[PDB]
Amino acid sequence: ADFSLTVLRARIALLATAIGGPDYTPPYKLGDDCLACLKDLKRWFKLVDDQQKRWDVAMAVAEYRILTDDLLPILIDWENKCSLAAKLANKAYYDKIALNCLQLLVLMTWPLIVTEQSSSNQITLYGELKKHQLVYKKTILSMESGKVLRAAIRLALDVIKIDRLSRTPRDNMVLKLVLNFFRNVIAIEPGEFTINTKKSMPKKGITSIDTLPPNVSMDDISLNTVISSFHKNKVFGFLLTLTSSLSDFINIPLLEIMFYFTKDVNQELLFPRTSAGFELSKLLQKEHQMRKNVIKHTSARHSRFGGLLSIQTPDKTRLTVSGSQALVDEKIALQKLDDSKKWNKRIIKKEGLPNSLLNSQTGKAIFFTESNGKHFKEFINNFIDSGFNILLHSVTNYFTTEQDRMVTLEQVEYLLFFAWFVKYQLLRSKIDNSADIKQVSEALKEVTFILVSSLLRSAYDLKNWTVTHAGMIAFNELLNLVSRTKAAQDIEFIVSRLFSDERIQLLSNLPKIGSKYSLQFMKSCIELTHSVLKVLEQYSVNFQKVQANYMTEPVIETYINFLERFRELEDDSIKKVFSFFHRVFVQAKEQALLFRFDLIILLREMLSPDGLDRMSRSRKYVSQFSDYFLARLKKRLKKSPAWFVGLLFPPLHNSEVGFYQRYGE
Amino acid sequence: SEPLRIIWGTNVSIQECTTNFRNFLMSFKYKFRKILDEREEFINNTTDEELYYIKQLNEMRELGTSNLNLDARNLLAYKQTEDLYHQLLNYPQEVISIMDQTIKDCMVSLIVDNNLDYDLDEIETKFYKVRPYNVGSC
Amino acid sequence: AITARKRRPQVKLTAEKLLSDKGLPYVLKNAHKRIRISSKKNSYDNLSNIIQFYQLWAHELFPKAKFKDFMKICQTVGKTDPVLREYRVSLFRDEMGM
Amino acid sequence: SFKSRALNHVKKVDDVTGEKVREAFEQFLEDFSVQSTDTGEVEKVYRAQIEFMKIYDLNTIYIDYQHLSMRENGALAMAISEQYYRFLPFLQKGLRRVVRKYAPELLNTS
Amino acid sequence: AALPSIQLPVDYNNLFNEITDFLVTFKQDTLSGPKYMAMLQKVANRELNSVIIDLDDILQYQNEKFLQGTQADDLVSAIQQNANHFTELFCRAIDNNMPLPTKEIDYKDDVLDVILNQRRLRNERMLSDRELFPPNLTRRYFLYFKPLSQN
Amino acid sequence: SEIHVRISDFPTIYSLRELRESNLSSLVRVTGVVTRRTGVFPQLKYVKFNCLKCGSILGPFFQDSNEEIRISFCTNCKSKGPFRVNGEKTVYRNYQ
Amino acid sequence: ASFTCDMCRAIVDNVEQSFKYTEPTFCPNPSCENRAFWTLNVTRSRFLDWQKVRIQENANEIPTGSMPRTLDVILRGDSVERAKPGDRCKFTGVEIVVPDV
């Protein structure tokens, strides 16, 4: 009962007074028995919140501001003691409270996850408890430019000094704990607005998803602040020299840190591919095209002017609409008579991991400042140039073992980590000849292919769609790299025999199921399919034997459902879809399968003035496709008036007439 | 075989109304108005052969301005448009919307038919209005 | 004995209605007459020339649903009715008998 | 457990015009360079005004529209004239980042 | 909500028949077609928008019928008592009896004719297996009762 | 039963023109002329309420100077309802 | 604005305000049943100084001595009370529609 809660909160408040405080003689000063008090607070975390599965101490500690107002002052001033002394060299004791402060920071910043196994109290407290971690992330990054980060690296340097031979299990743990601190500080991200669904929605939905507490802004949490404070505390230098020193107890958290940096940033944002103002002018012109389009869809006189059109149909019957512009344009009248319907078909629905490229909105960029972009890109450049192959070899040499116990989070973060840096180095090398494909050579060592294949095959068999999607992404970048090294030249021939049979079948069956899943799932299926087809064509066991496994209606449904988002897709993705159509329809000549009205509607909606950019290369491809498509449909209808009705339906799987429908003799 | 766009309650075809107005908004000459009104002997070719509404639309487009004044008797002076006058009086909002759209189409078509270069995007962005006046007895 | 108790009637698109004369036989009567495709016109116009007939026919057959929803119901019922399958194969059986 | 649904912000759409306006305006605010009746060393008037705000703990910044008008062919000035109500939050975002860079004391009432 | 009901000394089926018989029978013969049918012909030609019913005419009709020996139920007293209902009855009698026009009026410009013609076409298609309106919509005239002259 | 500490000699003063958002719920010291004084009234201070459903009596709410007591739901039956001021006990303070 | 739910002590915060006084539609707590039963937290929520001032067309700018046209101007924050009755002023800001709330 809540009496226990007020007793708890009272205890935590008294402990908050025991830690320390400012001294007017302003400087922060530790309390008497400070180490015992910090130990008792750590005890409270284990004793209550872990062992009873509560998070009540984790809430109370935020209420009484212990992290922001004691522990960060302690760590920053201890860092100042050690750094000022380092130029000049009872520290042997104060080092202990600094370590225990870092332990408490790792506890209070520990990434919260809620599942079915989480307690009722935990899932109740989750939403507000996340907010205090966001305050912690802000304060950790901002306070004295984040000098606590320098305190953390000093605590790590104080075991890196003693040899690889010297470091005890406690020293190894301390280094791993510092990595968990950096990982946590990166990893905190705003929570999701978790609505109760017992009671029906009112006449207005949710007012806003915003979960940030009032003293936080999303810019405080943005990657710009992380990169700035990490650069100004040389965290990047620490990580680079740490991975340079890898010659493996800590390898999983270090991998995890690189995942947590990469997980939501797009590689091409780090490359250009008055300039900002010029581009603003370009943006304004692009939306002005939409203005001159919506103007034609707008009444030239006021809304109450209200002249009535009547559409007489081809039969002796009449419809009526009020569209003032529609009086001179039956196109508008028809689509308005369609939009007038009150009816809509009812539509259908559909956690222990963070948001990422796996599930963001497809165009969701991160807006680096130029200095932060430079600092981040040079850091990951130096990482590729030093740490990639050894770290990937280290963690994959682990992960070939213990696959059965590889938790889902660990799987998805590993696959995404692999894919992101492979894609990045390919892009940097396509930009600069000075950058080497072989600097990510560990990707191609067959152990890696075997592991990623095992993860994809197992996740598909286990119907783990999350890891399935991530392994699909990893396969896309692996095949991308493989095609590049095929041009750069043996391993290409080797994998080009290993992905035979069962792997062909599995890859063929991802886009059969993909139509049921989110837009990013479908996008990754399409991307994989294009990569697979270009790889197999570069090889070209038989080409027709493989591609026939793809050319079937469930795959076409995935392609159409992906293409329904054309306004929100990128031009290159439309190009990829229409190149697939180009092969299937023009070259492979299974043209019957695309004579279906969903495509017809979609073609008109994007070729309409309300659709694609007039000067778009993808518009050029859709126009080029559509002329030939209409010509072929005209031919088939002239040869088959039955196909006027067949256009409406799935084609006939009763082969005895199905062949005739498909080809028409 | 095809749908028809009709002014509701009238059976007037909007294509017919459009072209009946177009063939007056271009190719009307002011000399015809003096045939309708009194003092018809005051017709004078050197002042009255003018394509009056081409002249209006040219000065209007050089000023870039949206509005055209239209004495409604000028419809009754012109053979393909005397019926449009009755449709204008009896069914005004539909006919006026048609006339507005026709003015915009005349402005668009002039800069590609008379074919002097102009900001097509400006005309595309702009709305156009007819202002009929002297409709009848006050 | 039981004096009346109420219930809510309902109607939806169905294979019998879709097989009535105003259904697909209307398409076979009118589609080749009303749609015309030409190289003399752009792709957008030709696509509209297809779409206008099917939209008007879909409305006149079943004015409840939007055109896209109508197409979805047509695809699903086409996927899942034997009478409609028999009629559809009968069209191509007739063309095979030509 | 309680029947409930996770509603997520990361699937939001972002106004690319607004974000690019914020980028342009933020750059203008931090580095618009001029000086007169003095040395040719540029004053960077709005950064200096942020320092004045930091001294006198103010909470407003005065901006000359003509300085925007000369900046970047006046495209930013035209955008802020035409569609001010859309772009004011984006201008506050840009101003907040500049204040973080050159006067982070001001991000609180302090 | 139920209601009680009573009997009264009136019958509107009977009085409707009396009204229509009057309407097709009476004329001011002492002044030497039926007066009201001529006036309804003028309404059909749309030259006249008002039908003026004279209670004097109903009195003279009653006197003629009573001289011929039949009862006439004193329609004058009835329609002085409850005139509002009898406007509706007289309009129903007119909307039944009213003849076609003798003069042409450029009919195609009348909106109500066009809209109800389109309705009739659609209803013929429906009835071919492929009232029509509220009566006030088709009733162009207005009906008025002129009082009894003092005599 | 109660004492009120009447704070005096508060050091910082404002004019009525000078009041702003930053003064909200702060103690302030102000000068002016009393332009219009209403009568002296009893006002509720501690008020119990009756729910007409379930066990009626509800515990004493403390009345403030700005808002009526809102009872969104009756705690004893955890539902909406009509409400009345309780007759068993209520207490009043002067108001003006 | 910022609100605490009536049937549980959870807090909604940073609630943007329309022209009407806007309260939250859903409780953030997945356990909770609440809609539209709230208490505003006056201390956590933030207000702004606000002042409407009515202006009329300049006497020397009216064309022929007819009535001057009027407008309602909203001042906020540091800009309030810089106007004065009878003063002749120049403002800059946004032309906006204000609904009948």
Ligand SMILES: [Zn+2]
């Ligand atoms: Zn109760």
Ligand SMILES: [Zn+2]
């Ligand atoms: Zn609640």
